[PDB]
PDB file of C-alpha atoms in Angstrom:
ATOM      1  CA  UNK A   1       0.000   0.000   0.000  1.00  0.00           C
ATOM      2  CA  UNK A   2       2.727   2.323  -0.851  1.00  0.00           C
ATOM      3  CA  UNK A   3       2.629   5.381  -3.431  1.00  0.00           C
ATOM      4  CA  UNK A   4       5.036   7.437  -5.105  1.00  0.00           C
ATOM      5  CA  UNK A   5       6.528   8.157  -8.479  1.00  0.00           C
ATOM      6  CA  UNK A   6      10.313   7.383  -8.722  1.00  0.00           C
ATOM      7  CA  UNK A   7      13.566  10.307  -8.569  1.00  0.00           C
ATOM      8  CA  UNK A   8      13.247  12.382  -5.588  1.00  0.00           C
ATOM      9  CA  UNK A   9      14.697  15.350  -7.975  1.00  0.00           C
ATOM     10  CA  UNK A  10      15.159  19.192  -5.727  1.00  0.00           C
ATOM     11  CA  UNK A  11      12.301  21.254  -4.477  1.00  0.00           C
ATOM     12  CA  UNK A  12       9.666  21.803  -6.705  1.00  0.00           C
ATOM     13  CA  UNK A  13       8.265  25.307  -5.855  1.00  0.00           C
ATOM     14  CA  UNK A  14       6.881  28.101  -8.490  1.00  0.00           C
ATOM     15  CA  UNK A  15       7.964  31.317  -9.387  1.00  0.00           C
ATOM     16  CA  UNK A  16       6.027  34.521  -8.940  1.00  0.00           C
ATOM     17  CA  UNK A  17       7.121  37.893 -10.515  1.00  0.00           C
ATOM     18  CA  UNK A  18       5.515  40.777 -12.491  1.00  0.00           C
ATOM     19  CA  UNK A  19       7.247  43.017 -15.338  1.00  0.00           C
ATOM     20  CA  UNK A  20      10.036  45.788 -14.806  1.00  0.00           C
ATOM     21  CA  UNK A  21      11.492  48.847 -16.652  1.00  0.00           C
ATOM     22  CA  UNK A  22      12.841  46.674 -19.395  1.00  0.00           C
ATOM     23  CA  UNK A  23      11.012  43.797 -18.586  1.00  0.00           C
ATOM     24  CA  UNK A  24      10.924  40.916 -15.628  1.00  0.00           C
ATOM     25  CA  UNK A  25      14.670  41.445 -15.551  1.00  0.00           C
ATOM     26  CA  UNK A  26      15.765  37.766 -16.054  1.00  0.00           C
ATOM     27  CA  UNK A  27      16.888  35.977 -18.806  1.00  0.00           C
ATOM     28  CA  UNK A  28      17.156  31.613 -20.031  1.00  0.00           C
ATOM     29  CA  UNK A  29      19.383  29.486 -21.225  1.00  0.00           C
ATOM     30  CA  UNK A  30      19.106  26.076 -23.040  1.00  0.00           C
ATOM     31  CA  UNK A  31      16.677  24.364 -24.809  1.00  0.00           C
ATOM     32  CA  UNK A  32      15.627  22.007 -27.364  1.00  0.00           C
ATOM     33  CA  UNK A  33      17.095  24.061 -29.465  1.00  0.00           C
ATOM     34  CA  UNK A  34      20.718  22.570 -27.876  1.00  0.00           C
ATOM     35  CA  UNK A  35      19.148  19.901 -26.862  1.00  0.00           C
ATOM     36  CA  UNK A  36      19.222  21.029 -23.165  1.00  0.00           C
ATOM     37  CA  UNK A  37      17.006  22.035 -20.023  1.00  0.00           C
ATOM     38  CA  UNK A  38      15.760  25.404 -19.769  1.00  0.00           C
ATOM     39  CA  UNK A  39      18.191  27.770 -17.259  1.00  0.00           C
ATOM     40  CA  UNK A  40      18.205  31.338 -15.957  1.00  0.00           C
ATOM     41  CA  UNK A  41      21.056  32.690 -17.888  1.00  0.00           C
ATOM     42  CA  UNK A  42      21.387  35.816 -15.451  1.00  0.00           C
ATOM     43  CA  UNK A  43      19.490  38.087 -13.976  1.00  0.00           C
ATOM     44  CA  UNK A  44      18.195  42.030 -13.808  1.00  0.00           C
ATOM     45  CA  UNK A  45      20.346  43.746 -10.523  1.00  0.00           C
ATOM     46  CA  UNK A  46      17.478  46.636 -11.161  1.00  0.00           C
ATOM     47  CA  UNK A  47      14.601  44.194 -12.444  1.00  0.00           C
ATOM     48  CA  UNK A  48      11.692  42.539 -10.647  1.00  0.00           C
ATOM     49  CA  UNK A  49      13.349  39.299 -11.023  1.00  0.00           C
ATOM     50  CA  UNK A  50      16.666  39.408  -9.113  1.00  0.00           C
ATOM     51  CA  UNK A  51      14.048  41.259  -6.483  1.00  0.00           C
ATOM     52  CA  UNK A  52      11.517  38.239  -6.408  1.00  0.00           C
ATOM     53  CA  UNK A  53      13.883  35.297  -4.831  1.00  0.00           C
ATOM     54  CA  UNK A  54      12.261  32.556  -5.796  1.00  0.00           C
ATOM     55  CA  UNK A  55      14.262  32.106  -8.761  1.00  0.00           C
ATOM     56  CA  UNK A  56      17.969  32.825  -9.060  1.00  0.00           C
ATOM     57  CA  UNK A  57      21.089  32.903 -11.673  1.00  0.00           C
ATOM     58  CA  UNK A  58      21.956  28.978 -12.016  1.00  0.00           C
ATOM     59  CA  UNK A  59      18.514  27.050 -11.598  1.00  0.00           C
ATOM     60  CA  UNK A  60      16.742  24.448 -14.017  1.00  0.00           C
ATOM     61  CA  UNK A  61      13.121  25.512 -15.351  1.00  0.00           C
ATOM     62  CA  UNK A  62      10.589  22.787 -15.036  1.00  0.00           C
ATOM     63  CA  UNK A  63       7.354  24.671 -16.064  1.00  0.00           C
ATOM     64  CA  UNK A  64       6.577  28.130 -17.854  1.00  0.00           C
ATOM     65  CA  UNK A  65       3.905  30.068 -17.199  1.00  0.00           C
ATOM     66  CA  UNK A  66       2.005  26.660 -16.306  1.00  0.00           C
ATOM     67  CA  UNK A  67       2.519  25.204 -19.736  1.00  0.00           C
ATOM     68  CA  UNK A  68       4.910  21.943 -19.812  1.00  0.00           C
ATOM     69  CA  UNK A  69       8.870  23.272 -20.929  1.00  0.00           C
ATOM     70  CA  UNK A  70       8.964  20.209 -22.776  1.00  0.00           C
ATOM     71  CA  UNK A  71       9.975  19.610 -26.587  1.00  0.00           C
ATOM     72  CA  UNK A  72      10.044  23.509 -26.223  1.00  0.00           C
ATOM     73  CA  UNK A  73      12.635  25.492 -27.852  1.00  0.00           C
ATOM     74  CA  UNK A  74      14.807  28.648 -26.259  1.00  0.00           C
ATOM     75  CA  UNK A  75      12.875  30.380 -28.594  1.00  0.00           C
ATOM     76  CA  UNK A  76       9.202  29.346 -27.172  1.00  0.00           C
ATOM     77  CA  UNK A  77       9.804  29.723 -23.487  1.00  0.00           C
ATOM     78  CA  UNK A  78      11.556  33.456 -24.705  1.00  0.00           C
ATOM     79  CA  UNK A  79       7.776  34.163 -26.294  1.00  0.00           C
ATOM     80  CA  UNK A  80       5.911  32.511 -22.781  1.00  0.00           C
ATOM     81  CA  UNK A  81       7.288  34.968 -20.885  1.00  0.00           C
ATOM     82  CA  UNK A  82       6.042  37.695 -23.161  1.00  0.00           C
ATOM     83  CA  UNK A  83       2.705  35.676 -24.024  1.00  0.00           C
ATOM     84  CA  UNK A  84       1.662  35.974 -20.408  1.00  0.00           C
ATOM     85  CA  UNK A  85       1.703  39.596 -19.988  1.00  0.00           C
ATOM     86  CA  UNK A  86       3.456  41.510 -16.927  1.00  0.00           C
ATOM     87  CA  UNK A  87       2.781  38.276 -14.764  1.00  0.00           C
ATOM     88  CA  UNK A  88       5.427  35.413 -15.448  1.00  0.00           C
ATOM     89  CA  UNK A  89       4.967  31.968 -13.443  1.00  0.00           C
ATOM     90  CA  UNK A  90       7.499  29.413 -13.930  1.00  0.00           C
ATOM     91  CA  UNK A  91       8.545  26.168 -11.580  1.00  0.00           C
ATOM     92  CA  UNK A  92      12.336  26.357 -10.427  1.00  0.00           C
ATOM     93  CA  UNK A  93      14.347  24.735  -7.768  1.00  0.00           C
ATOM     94  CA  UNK A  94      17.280  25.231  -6.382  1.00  0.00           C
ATOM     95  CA  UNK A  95      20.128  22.851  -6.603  1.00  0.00           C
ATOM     96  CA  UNK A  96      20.864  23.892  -2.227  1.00  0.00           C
ATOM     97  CA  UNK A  97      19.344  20.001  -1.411  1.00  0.00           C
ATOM     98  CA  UNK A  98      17.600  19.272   1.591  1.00  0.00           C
ATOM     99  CA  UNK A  99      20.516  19.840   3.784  1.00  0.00           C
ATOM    100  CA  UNK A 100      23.558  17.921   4.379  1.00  0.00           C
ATOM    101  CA  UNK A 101      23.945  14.324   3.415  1.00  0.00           C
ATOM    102  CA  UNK A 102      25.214  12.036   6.135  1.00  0.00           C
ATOM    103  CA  UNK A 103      23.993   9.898   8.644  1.00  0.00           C
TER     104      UNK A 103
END
């Protein structure tokens, strides 16, 4: 009577951020385009981004704006963030772990 889905893979939490002077102030990296996960290149030191927290410089994109970054291309996920508007939603964790392993 057990139940679970296999690879206990980092913390899955979402991203919430609205639009800045030049934008949400955070770039990607990666894609099917290279054949690669989608990344935060960098991000805005003055945008909404670098501001929000739940997503920094060096984390793997799971979701966009609710819509499956899969078979997706750098290209796509670049036209999400501007399909949704001022309000961007995307699923990141951060590669921190749960703590130190030992025991």
């Amino acid at each position: 009577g057990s139940s679970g889905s296999s690879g206990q893979d980092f913390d899955y939490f979402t991203v919430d951020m609205e639009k800045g002077a030049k934008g949400f102030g955070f770039s990607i990296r990666g894609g099917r385009e290279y054949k690669m996960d989608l990344y935060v290149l960098r991000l805005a030191e003055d945008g909404p981004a670098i501001r929000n927290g739940r997503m920094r410089v060096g984390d793997q994109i799971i979701e966009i704006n609710g819509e499956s970054t899969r078979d997706m291309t750098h290209a796509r996920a670049i036209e999400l963030i501007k399909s949704g508007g001022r309000r961007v939603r995307l699923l990141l964790k951060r590669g921190t772990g749960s703590g130190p392993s030992s025991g």
